């Protein structure tokens, strides 16, 4: 269709304003081609010319499916812009029109509507909730209502999955509770599909849903997806592991019962790998996830011990991206505040002291508080054993004292005060 290549906006207005349906189609296609060029589509020039209302209008032309598709694609690309550009589409009444197109007999047109609705809901809470109020969920879910997902076109299924994930996205406020319940069963089904992109996006959706109040985590865990998530956690593809780890990590921020679900699922066996993972970010979120587990019950802190994960924490505390090291500090402080004397002793035997002292030289008052704090916990445990002195030496040996004393003259009241106490109570 070489005729509709690189038209001027004024020519496009000319064709759309003509009273010829075919002319309108050619002009709409040309607009779509401008909006689809590899670099900088003239989204604002198109909006300024007042073309949105026309395009939205062509969405309803059941008798001319070709113009439905062209305007649907044009509107989609406009909607992929800034909030203001996305708003211009919503303002034109595109939401209900796109929902009606979801039932189109033409797969490519229905898919376009799915894409567009995905861009609209992806702008944030307000438009997401507006899409939901217009009743987009039923039609969307109905498109996946087939015996076997594998008979659906791959590109088509990735699109639906992605759009559903956006309906599950954002937090202030979180998606409507009944909307999440409606979507979850399908999300669970997509989580078992064989396509890597479907899996990744499904995990992201589950990660958005588990990112909030423990009641939200509950409705997700209630579906029994933790085992599948743990499995996806051991996936070869980084794009699947990242979202899986996020979901698992969010779940352990909940109650001890919910945390126990991932432990029972066998998640801890994967961490030796995650804690030494080549990507700093997988390594950081893994340590963060570990920190919320050591913040659990002692029987849970023991499972962390039994899987031999303390040594991995010592390693991350010893050498890692600083952010990860900071998450390691927390994991340790949590372990020491809730652990038994035996578990805290074990932590020391694994060699946690030296790497913990070296991190006292970090320019970050918060981590410094967290560390010093952990030290206090450990001494406290050594006191109940009359071995407070053996601990002091050890801290001296590696140069911990020569740093706790220096912090004693820090400018943060939390720090120096915490320092003083230690020195004047243990050194």
């Amino acid at each position: 269709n070489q005729g509709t290549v690189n038209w001027s906006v004024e020519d496009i207005v000319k064709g759309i304003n003509s009273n010829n349906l075919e002319s309108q189609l050619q002009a709409t296609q040309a607009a779509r081609k401008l909006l689809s060029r590899e670099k900088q589509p003239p989204i604002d020039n198109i909006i300024r010319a007042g073309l949105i209302p026309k395009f939205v209008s062509f969405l309803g032309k059941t008798d001319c499916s070709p113009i439905q598709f062209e305007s649907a694609w044009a509107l989609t690309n406009i909607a992929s812009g800034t909030s203001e550009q996305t708003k211009a589409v919503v303002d034109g009444g595109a939401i209900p029109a796109f929902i009606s197109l979801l039932a189109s007999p033409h797969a490519h047109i229905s898919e376009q509507a799915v894409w567009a609705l995905g861009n609209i809901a992806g702008d944030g809470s307000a438009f997401r909730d507006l899409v939901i109020k217009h009743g987009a969920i039923d039609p969307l879910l109905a498109l996946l209502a087939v015996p076997d997902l594998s008979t659906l076109a791959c590109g088509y299924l990735r699109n639906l999955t992605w759009t559903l994930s956006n309906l599950c996205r954002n937090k202030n406020p979180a998606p409507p509770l009944d909307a999440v319940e409606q979507i979850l069963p399908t999300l669970v089904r997509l989580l078992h599909h064989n396509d890597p992109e479907v899996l990744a996006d499904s995990c992201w959706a589950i990660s958005y849903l588990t990112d909030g109040p423990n009641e939200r985590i509950e409705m997700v865990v209630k579906k029994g997806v933790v085992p599948q998530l743990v499995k996806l956690l051991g996936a070869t593809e980084l794009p699947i592991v990242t979202p899986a780890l996020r979901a698992i990590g969010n779940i352990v921020t909940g109650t001890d019962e919910q945390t126990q679900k991932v432990i029972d699922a066998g998640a801890l066996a994967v961490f030796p790998s995650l804690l030494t993972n080549p990507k700093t970010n997988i390594q950081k979120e893994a340590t963060w996830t570990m920190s919320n587990i050591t913040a659990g019950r002692q029987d849970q802190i023991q499972q962390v011990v039994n899987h031999g994960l303390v040594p991995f924490l010592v390693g991350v505390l010893s050498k890692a991206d600083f952010k990860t090291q900071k998450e390691a500090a927390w994991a340790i402080t949590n372990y020491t505040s809730g652990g038994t004397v035996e578990q805290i002793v074990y932590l020391v035997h694994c060699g946690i002291i030296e790497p913990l002292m070296n991190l006292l030289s970090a320019k970050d008052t918060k981590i410094i508080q967290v560390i010093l704090d952990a030290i206090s916990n450990i001494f406290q445990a050594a006191e109940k054993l009359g071995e407070t002195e053996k601990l002091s030496i050890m801290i001296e040996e590696c140069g911990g004292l020569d740093k706790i004393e220096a912090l004693q003259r820090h400018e943060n009241e939390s720090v120096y005060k915490a320092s003083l106490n230690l020195i004047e109570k243990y050194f």
Partner: peptide, 11 residues
């Protein structure tokens, strides 16, 4: 990083 919030249909 997480999936794009929006996507432009290229070409």
């Amino acid at each position: 990083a997480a999936p794009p919030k929006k996507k432009r249909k290229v070409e």
